[PDB]
C-alpha cells in the first residue's frame, strides 16, 4: 500500500536499471529483488551494494 501510493513511481523497467538507480540514490532507494541476483551484484565492482 506504500508502493501503490508513492510518487514518483518506485517500480523500475529492468533489474539493471533498478540496480543503477540504487547506486544513483545514495541510500535513498531500496531494491526488492531475488536473493541470488542481489548477491551476484553485491559480488561485482564497485561493490557499493
Amino acid at each position: 500500500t506504500y508502493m501503490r501510493s508513492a510518487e514518483p513511481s518506485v517500480f523500475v523497467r529492468t533489474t539493471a536499471e533498478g540496480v543503477a538507480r540504487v547506486r544513483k540514490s545514495k541510500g535513498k532507494y531500496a531494491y526488492l529483488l531475488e536473493s541470488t541476483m542481489n548477491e551476484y551484484i553485491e559480488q561485482r565492482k564497485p561493490c557499493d551494494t
Partner: protein, 189 residues
C-alpha cells in the same frame, strides 16, 4: 598609541588596505589550487564564484562553480542546503566588504563635525563586525570545500584583510577612549 594625526592617518590607511584586500579576495579567482574538471581532471585554481583551469588542455576556461549540481544531486538536509546557499551567495565575505566600506565612510566623516564622538565608536564596531564576518566566511568556505589541495593568494589576502580590520577597529576604539578621556579631563579642570 601616540598623538592624533599619526593615529588618524594610520587608521585610515589600514582601513583602506583592508577594504582593498577583501575586495581583491572576493573579486579574484585564486583561492584553492586543486584537481578537477574545468569544463578530464586537471589542475584548476578556484575562487568564490568561478574556477579557472590551470595548466589544462583548454587553459583559461573560467567556468562557474557547480554550487547546486544537477544529475541526481541526492538532495541535502536543511543545514547542508543552508551551508551550500551561504557558500554560493558568499553573503559573509560581501558583508565583511560592505562593513569595511561603512567603517571607512564613518572614519572619513569623522573629519567633519569632530564634536560627535560616537561616529568613531560606530566605525570600530563596524570593523570588528567585518572581521567576525570574515571569520565566518572563511569557516563556511573551508567547510564547503571539504564535502591534495592548496590555498591561493586571495585566501591569504582575505586573512590579512581580517587581521588588518581587527587592528584598525582596535585603533578606532582606542581613539574613542582617548577622545572621551580628553573630554573628561577638560570637564574636570
Amino acid at each position: 598609541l601616540f598623538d592624533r594625526g599619526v593615529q588618524m592617518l594610520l587608521t585610515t590607511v589600514g582601513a583602506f588596505a583592508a577594504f582593498s584586500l577583501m575586495t581583491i579576495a572576493v573579486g579574484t579567482d585564486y583561492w584553492l589550487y586543486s584537481r578537477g574538471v574545468c569544463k578530464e581532471e586537471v589542475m584548476t585554481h578556484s575562487g568564490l564564484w568561478r574556477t579557472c583551469c590551470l595548466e589544462g588542455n583548454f587553459k583559461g576556461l573560467c567556468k562557474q562553480i557547480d554550487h547546486f549540481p544537477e544529475d541526481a544531486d541526492y538532495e541535502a538536509d536543511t543545514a547542508e542546503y543552508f551551508l551550500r546557499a551561504v557558500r554560493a551567495s558568499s553573503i559573509f565575505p560581501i558583508l565583511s566588504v560592505i562593513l569595511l566600506f561603512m567603517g571607512g565612510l564613518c572614519i572619513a566623516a569623522s573629519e567633519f563635525y569632530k564634536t560627535r564622538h560616537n561616529i568613531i565608536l560606530s566605525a570600530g564596531i563596524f570593523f570588528v563586525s567585518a572581521g567576525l564576518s570574515n571569520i565566518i566566511g572563511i569557516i563556511v568556505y573551508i567547510s564547503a570545500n571539504a564535502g591534495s589541495y592548496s590555498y591561493g593568494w586571495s585566501f591569504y589576502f582575505g586573512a590579512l584583510s581580517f587581521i588588518i580590520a581587527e587592528m584598525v577597529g582596535v585603533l578606532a576604539v582606542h581613539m574613542f577612549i582617548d577622545r572621551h578621556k580628553q573630554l573628561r579631563a577638560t570637564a574636570r579642570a
